[PDB]
C-alpha cells in the first residue's frame, strides 16, 4: 500500500516527499506541477535506535565523502565497499577488519537507514543560557515572570553557564554572585554597541564573570531573580514606558558573540511590551498613537516598521552566523513588535511564544515545556546543527524553507533555480528539537534516485552527534512515466509544501493567483474529464483532497492577513514553517469532533452543516482548542457528554508545544465566532465548481 509506504517512511526516516517516484526524463522533470520536495524532520524520535559510538565511515573521494549506508554495495570478501553516490570504491577502516557477513555494521541494514553516530574527542562545551528580561510591565506580570525563570533555573544542567540581563530605559548586564554587593553594568538603551566595543567596555571548564556554571551560581541567581523590580524610571501621564528592547537584545548577542562564539547558547528574551526607543523601535511613547496595524502598514502610516525590522534582521543574522539561538517570549495586552523581531527566532531555531500575560497557565505552562526532558533527564533540544544533503548526480537542490540559514556552500548539488534559502548544499540550524521540520526543494537535471541527509549538532549532553538518513526513491519507468508519478503522489505532503512556498513569498512579497494556476494545472494533468464538461471531472483517491486543502489554505489566516494583527500573523507563520506534516494540516484545516448521545465522539466536516444544536463540538486549531455547545446543550449521562470533549481536550492540550489557547463557548456566545470562521472565492462547493469549469476548458 502506497499509504503504508508513506507512513513507514516518515516513521523511520522522518521524511515525506511530494512524489515517491521521480521523472526519469528531462521532458517530465521540467513539466512537474508540484516540485519534488520533502518535508524533512532531522531529529524525529522513534523506537530507541542504537547510538553508534564509532566514527561513521566516510567515502574516500574529496568531493563526495558520503556516509556508508544500506544503499552502498559491499564485498565482505575484499573488505571493500562502493559508494552509491559516486561509485568510488572504498577500503574498510581498521576497526572494521573483523567485518563479517553473519555480523555486519549497523549502518548497512535497511532498518538503520536513518541512524545516529556519536563523536567523542574534544571536551564538550557546557550549555549557555542568557536570560534577557524586560522590567517594564505590571507587578503581577513581573512576579509571574520571575517565578517562571526561577523554575527554569532548577531544571538546567549543573554544567551549563547562565547570564542575566535586565532592561527598561537602560540595559543592565549582571556580573553574577560578586558577594556582598551584587553588581551590573549599565548601558543606555539609546545607542547600539557592536561586540568589540562591548568586549572592551566589559573586559578545566570555562566561564566569564557574566556566564557562570549553574551549580556554583544557582543560589545567587535564584535570589537576584527573586529581587528583580520593575524599571525604576517613572511613566508620566499618557506615556508608554521607555523600553530599550532593541539594544538589550544586541548587547545580549554581542555578549555571547565575544565570549563563546560557535557553540550552543540560548538567548531567551522576555517582553512585556513593544520597543519604544530604537534602534529596533516599534512605536512611540505617546499612548495617543496606537501600535501599527496591517491597515496602517498598507497605507504607509507606520514609520518604524522597516528601520525596526532591519535592526532585528541584522541581529538575527549576527546570532545565526555565530551559531546562537534567539528565543522571544512576549506577553502583553497590546502588540509587542513580533513583526519586526520575527527573524531572530525564525532564522535561528529560536522559539516564539505569545500570550496576554506572564501571569497565566498558558505562558507558565508553555514556558516549562521548553525544558521537557527525555528518558535520560536531558533537554529535547540540539544546538548549532549543520544540515548537508548529498544527492545522486541526477538531483539538484533549489532550496529550503524553514528555520535555517545558508552556509552558502557551492557544489554540483546546487541548482541555478533557488527557492527560499537556496544556492547551498549546507544549512545551519542553530536551535532544533525532535519537531523541527525544514522543507527541501529538489530538482531533476534500473531505478532509484538517492538523497542523504547529514545532520551534525551539539546535544544537551554536550556530546556532538551526527544524524544520518539516506532515502531512495524509484526512477519512473519510461513506458509508464506519468501513471507511476501520479500513483506516488502525497497530496498532504504536497499541500503543505505548496503552502510553504506561498507563505514564504507572501512574507517576502498575487500569491493566491500562483496557488490557483497550479491547482488548475494539477487538476488538468492528473484529473479525469471530458473537455468543456465540468461534471465529468473526478480525481483519484490519490488527489481528491488536494483541492480542499487548497480551499482552506487560501482562505486561512496565513495569507489573508487583515482581521489579524501583524504580530498574530508573524506568530502563526513562524510556527507553520517549523511543524511536521500532521500538525501543518491541522493548522490549515482544523479537525472537528462531534459529541452527542447518539453515538460516541466522531470527526465531522468543517461545514456549517456540522453545527448541530444537540451536539458538542471540539475544534482543534493547532493554535487553539475550542469546545462548542449548540443552543440545546447550552443548558451521569448528560455529564459523560458535557465532559467528553473536556477530557479529550486535556490530552492533546499538553503534548503540543505552544500550549493552544483553550475555549469554552456556545451558540450565542461571542467566542463562538472562532468556530464560525473556520467552518464552511466563497464556499467550497462554489470553489469546486469554478475549479471544474476551468479544469475542463483550455489549458
Amino acid at each position: 500500500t502506497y499509504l503504508e509506504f508513506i507512513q513507514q517512511n516518515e516513521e523511520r526516516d522522518g521524511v515525506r516527499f511530494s512524489w515517491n517516484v521521480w521523472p526519469s526524463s528531462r521532458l517530465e522533470a521540467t513539466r512537474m506541477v508540484v516540485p519534488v520536495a520533502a518535508l524533512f524532520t532531522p531529529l524525529k524520535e522513534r523506537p530507541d535506535l542504537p547510538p553508534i559510538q564509532y566514527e561513521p565511515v566516510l567515502c574516500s573521494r574529496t568531493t563526495c565523502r558520503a556516509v556508508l549506508n544500506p544503499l552502498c554495495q559491499v564485498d565482505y570478501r575484499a573488505k571493500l565497499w562502493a559508494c552509491n553516490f559516486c561509485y568510488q570504491r572504498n577500503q574498510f577502516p581498521p576497526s572494521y577488519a573483523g567485518i563479517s557477513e553473519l555480523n555486519q555494521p549497523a549502518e548497512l541494514l535497511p532498518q538503520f537507514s536513518s541512524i545516529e553516530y556519536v563523536v567523542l574527542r574534544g571536551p564538550q562545551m557546557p550549555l549557555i543560557f542568557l536570560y534577557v528580561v524586560d522590567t517594564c510591565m505590571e507587578d503581577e506580570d513581573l512576579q509571574a515572570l520571575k517565578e517562571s525563570m526561577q523554575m527554569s533555573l532548577s531544571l538546567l544542567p549543573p554544567t551549563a553557564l547562565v547570564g542575566l540581563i535586565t532592561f527598561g530605559r537602560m540595559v543592565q548586564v549582571h556580573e553574577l554572585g560578586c558577594e556582598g554587593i551584587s553588581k551590573s553594568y549599565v548601558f543606555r538603551g539609546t545607542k547600539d554597541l557592536s561586540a568589540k566595543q562591548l568586549q572592551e567596555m566589559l573586559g578545566p571548564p570555562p566561564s566569564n564573570r557574566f556566564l557562570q556554571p549553574v551549580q556554583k551560581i544557582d543560589m545567587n541567581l535564584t535570589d537576584l531573580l527573586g529581587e528583580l523590580q520593575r524599571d525604576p524610571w517613572p511613566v508620566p501621564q499618557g506615556k508608554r514606558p521607555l523600553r530599550s528592547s532593541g539594544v538589550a537584545l544586541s548587547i545580549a548577542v554581542g555578549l555571547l558573540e565575544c565570549t563563546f562564539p560557535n557553540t550552543g547558547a540560548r538567548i531567551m528574551m522576555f517582553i512585556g511590551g513593544p520597543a519604544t526607543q530604537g534602534p529596533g523601535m516599534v512605536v512611540g511613547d505617546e499612548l495617543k498613537t496606537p501600535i501599527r496595524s496591517w491597515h496602517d502598514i498598507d497605507k504607509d502610516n507606520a514609520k518604524y516598521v522597516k528601520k525596526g525590522t532591519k535592526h532585528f534582521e541584522a541581529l538575527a543574522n549576527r546570532a545565526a552566523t555565530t551559531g546562537h539561538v534567539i528565543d522571544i517570549y512576549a506577553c502583553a495586552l497590546d502588540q509587542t513588535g513580533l513583526l519586526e523581531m520575527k527573524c531572530c527566532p525564525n532564522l535561528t531555531g529560536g522559539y516564539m511564544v505569545m500570550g496576554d500575560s506572564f501571569n497565566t497557565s498558558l505562558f507558565k505552562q508553555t514556558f516549562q515545556r521548553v525544558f521537557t526532558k527525555d528518558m535520560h533527564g536531558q533537554f529535547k533540544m540540539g544546538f548549532g546543527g549543520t544540515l548537508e544533503i548529498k544527492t545522486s548526480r541526477e538531483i539538484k537542490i533549489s532550496g529550503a524553507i524553514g528555520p535555517c540559514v545558508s552556509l552558502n556552500s557551492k557544489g554540483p548539488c546546487v541548482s541555478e533555480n533557488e527557492i527560499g534559502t537556496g544556492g547551498t548544499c549546507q544549512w545551519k540550524i542553530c536551535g532544533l528539537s525532535p519537531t523541527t521540520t525544514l522543507a527541501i526543494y529538489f530538482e531533476v537535471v534500473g531505478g532509484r534516485g538517492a538523497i542523504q541527509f547529514v545532520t551534525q549538532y551539539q546535544h544537551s549532553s554536550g556530546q556532538r552527534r551526527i544524524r544520518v538518513t539516506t532515502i531512495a526513491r524509484n526512477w519512473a519507468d519510461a513506458q509508464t512515466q506519468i501513471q507511476n508519478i501520479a500513483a506516488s503522489f502525497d497530496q498532504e505532503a504536497a499541500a503543505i509544501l505548496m503552502a510553504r512556498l506561498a507563505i514564504y513569498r507572501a512574507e517576502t512579497e498575487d500569491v493566491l493567483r500562483w496557488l490557483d494556476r497550479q491547482l488548475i494545472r494539477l487538476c488538468q494533468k492528473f484529473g479525469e474529464y471530458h473537455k468543456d464538461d465540468p461534471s465529468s471531472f473526478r480525481f483519484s483517491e490519490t488527489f481528491s483532497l488536494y483541492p480542499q486543502f487548497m480551499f482552506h489554505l487560501r482562505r486561512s489566516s496565513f495569507l489573508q492577513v487583515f482581521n489579524n494583527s501583524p504580530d498574530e500573523s508573524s506568530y502563526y507563520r513562524h510556527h507553520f514553517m517549523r511543524q511536521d506534516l500532521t500538525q501543518s494540516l491541522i493548522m490549515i484545516q482544523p479537525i472537528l469532533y462531534a459529541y452527542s448521545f447518539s453515538g460516541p465522539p466522531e470527526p465531522v466536516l468543517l461545514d456549517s452543516s456540522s453545527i448541530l444544536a444537540d451536539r458538542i463540538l471540539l475544534m482543534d486549531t493547532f493554535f487553539q482548542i475550542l469546545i462548542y455547545h449548540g443552543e440545546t446543550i447550552a443548558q451521569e449521562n448528560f455529564r459523560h457528554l458535557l465532559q467528553a470533549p473536556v477530557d479529550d481536550a486535556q490530552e492533546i492540550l499538553h503534548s503540543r508545544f505552544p500550549m493552544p489557547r483553550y475555549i469554552d463557548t456556545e451558540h450565542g456566545g461571542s467566542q463562538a465566532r472562532f468556530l464560525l470562521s473556520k467552518v464552511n472565492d466563497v464556499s467550497l462547493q462554489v470553489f469546486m465548481d469554478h475549479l471544474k469549469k476551468l479544469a475542463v476548458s483550455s489549458a
Partner: protein, 137 residues
C-alpha cells in the same frame, strides 16, 4: 506632568516650604511669588491659571496657599488631589505655628513629605476657576 511645589502664608506671601529639581525654574518661580503677593482674603480659595505650555494649580486653607506648576497636559484632577494631601498633612503638623513664624522657609523639613508624596502622582503606574495667569498678575 512635571514638578514645582510651593506652600506660602497668604497674608504676606512668606514662603513656608518648597521643592524643585531640574536635572527654567527662574521664570515660573517669579510668577509663583507674584501670585502669592496678589493673593488675599478676597482671592478664590481654589483656582487654576493658564500660562502657555504651563498651568498653575492652587488651593488655600487657614491662610496658607498650596501652589503647584506643571505642563498643562497634566491632569487638573490629579493636581488638586496632590495639593489636598499636602494640606491635611501640613495643617495637621504645622497648621498652628504658621501664623507666628517670620523666617523664610521655616519648614524646609517639610521637604521630605512633599517629595515622597510628589512621586505618588507623577507615575501613571501607581495611580475651581480658570484664568490666564497673565491676568491676575
Amino acid at each position: 506632568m512635571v514638578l514645582l511645589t510651593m506652600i506660602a502664608r497668604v497674608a504676606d506671601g512668606l514662603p513656608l516650604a518648597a521643592s524643585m529639581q531640574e536635572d527654567d525654574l527662574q521664570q515660573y518661580q517669579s510668577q509663583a511669588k507674584q501670585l502669592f503677593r496678589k493673593l488675599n482674603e478676597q482671592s478664590p480659595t481654589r483656582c487654576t491659571l493658564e500660562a502657555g505650555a504651563m498651568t498653575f494649580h492652587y488651593i488655600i486653607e487657614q491662610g496658607v496657599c498650596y501652589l503647584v506648576l506643571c505642563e498643562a497636559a497634566f491632569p487638573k484632577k490629579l493636581a488638586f488631589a496632590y495639593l489636598e494631601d499636602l494640606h491635611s498633612e501640613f495643617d495637621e503638623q504645622h497648621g498652628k505655628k504658621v501664623p507666628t513664624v517670620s523666617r523664610p522657609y521655616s519648614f524646609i523639613e517639610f521637604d521630605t513629605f512633599i517629595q515622597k508624596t510628589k512621586k505618588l502622582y507623577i507615575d501613571s503606574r501607581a495611580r475651581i476657576m480658570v484664568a490666564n495667569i497673565e491676568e491676575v498678575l
